[PDB]
Amino acid sequence: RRRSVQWCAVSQPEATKCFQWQRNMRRVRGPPVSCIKRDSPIQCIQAIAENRADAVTLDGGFIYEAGLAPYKLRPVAAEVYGTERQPRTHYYAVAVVKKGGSFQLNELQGLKSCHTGLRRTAGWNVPIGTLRPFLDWTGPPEPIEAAVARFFSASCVPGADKGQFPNLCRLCAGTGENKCAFSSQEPYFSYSGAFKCLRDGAGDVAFIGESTVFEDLSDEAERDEYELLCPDNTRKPVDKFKDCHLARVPSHAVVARSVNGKEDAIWNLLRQAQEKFGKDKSPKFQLFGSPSGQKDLLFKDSAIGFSRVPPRIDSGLYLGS
């Protein structure tokens, strides 16, 4: 039906969560949500621009992508992180390494790297931009990936072209054709996957978000075996990310068509869904939770709510501050 917000999933597990979201909203007589299934942010971005879906949550890198032509989607609601007592609409891109090593951020040449994915904020845009000075990139037409592939001995950059940049997919753990996939079929995909790539010892550094280590390692003693590479070339505890990060970046956000995008219905849905199924709100459904073996389905597991984006704020403006 027309009045229902059509959400776009990028995997089957997300589709399954969306359908559960749909029946739960229906049970509590809240705003209706329907589900559309795709395989990547790009297919969801396109599907929305083509009125086949209405909304999707994207990392900063794809919020950028979605704002260009022929899509022109804009962020309508940002994820909120931190705590209810201290909420924030931004997180931190950090460089996590194993304690015991002596190399600093300016000494990564020849080492192995783990990234959340190609063109993702913390996993790529931020770290690569930060390391530019150390690369020997000759600018266009040479794709930046080529320079990165010459810098790190090997890496796992989900979504990178295994054909042109084999080095960038070498450390990835996906089976057969799924090796280096920009999806959960690749064990080292996204935040937790990139961190696992470090935990397993495949890589020497993981470019992820500051909350990853805390979500994945409950034991304080285990987390103490990791530290962060600070921009001033020093190492510090994973809990000191505020004084040791590569960048502070805007939170992932739900995007929608800039014209006739059902913005008000989308916000009504998010506000009520947050209230009914947000953190510690319901035993039957968790808008911000994912089943065992799954991470950040539809929204980050670390999200605690939403913040509506003021009108006439396009992708460009959202990301630039």
Cα separations in angstroms, 317 against 41, 272, 312:
20, 27, 9
* Nearer residue to Fe ion within complex by CB, 157 or 265: 157
Span interacting with Fe ion, options 21-29, 51-59, 78-86, 99-107, rule CB under 5 A:
51-59
Residue 16 C-beta: closest distance to Fe ion, Å? 22
* Nearer residue to Fe ion within complex by CB, 22 or 40: 40
Residue 212 interacts with Fe ion (CB under 5 A)? no
Residue 93 C-beta: closest distance to Fe ion, Å? 8
30 is in an annotated binding site: no
Helix (H) or strand (E) run with residue 277 in it: helix 263-277
- Measured in degrees and rounded to the nearest 5, phi and psi for residue 190 equal 65, -170
191 is in an annotated binding site: yes
* Nearer residue to Fe ion within complex by CB, 59 or 210: 59
Quote the strand ranges of 210-275, DSSP E.
226-230, 234-237, 247-250, 253-257
121 is in an annotated binding site: no
- Measured in degrees and rounded to the nearest 5, phi and psi for residue 157 equal -125, 90
Span interacting with Fe ion, options 40-48, 69-77, 118-126, 199-207, rule CB under 5 A:
118-126
What the block records as the tokens of 119 is 């063109």
Choice from 59, 79, 186, 204 touching Fe ion (CB under 5 A): 59
What sign results for the dihedral spanned by CA atoms 97, 250, 40, 151? negative
- Name the residue number minimizing CB distance to Fe ion: 59
What the block records as the tokens of 314 is 């396009």
Residue 121 interacts with Fe ion (CB under 5 A)? yes
9 is in an annotated binding site: no
Cα separations in angstroms, 94 against 103, 108, 236:
15, 14, 11
- The closest of 257, 277, 245, 275 to 55, measured between CA atoms, is 257
Span interacting with Fe ion, options 50-58, 114-122, 155-163, 193-201, rule CB under 5 A:
114-122
DSSP letter for 181, please: -
Residue 209 C-beta: closest distance to Fe ion, Å? 6
Residues counted in the chain: 321
* Nearer residue to Fe ion within complex by CB, 31 or 193: 193
Residue 57 interacts with Fe ion (CB under 5 A)? no
* Nearer residue to Fe ion within complex by CB, 31 or 60: 60
Interface of this chain with Fe ion, residues 94 to 113, rule: CB under 5 A = none
Q: How far apart are CA 208 and CA 111, in angstroms?
A: 17
Q: Which residues have a Cβ under 8 Å from the Cβ of 20 and sit 6 or more positions away?
A: 285
Rounded to 10 degrees, the C-alpha dihedral 151/180/75/296 comes to -120
User: Which segments are annotated as binding site?
Assistant: 59, 91, 116, 120, 122-123, 191, 252
User: Which segments are annotated as binding site for hydrogencarbonate?
Assistant: 116, 120, 122-123
Q: Which residues bind Fe ion (CB under 5 A)?
A: 59, 121
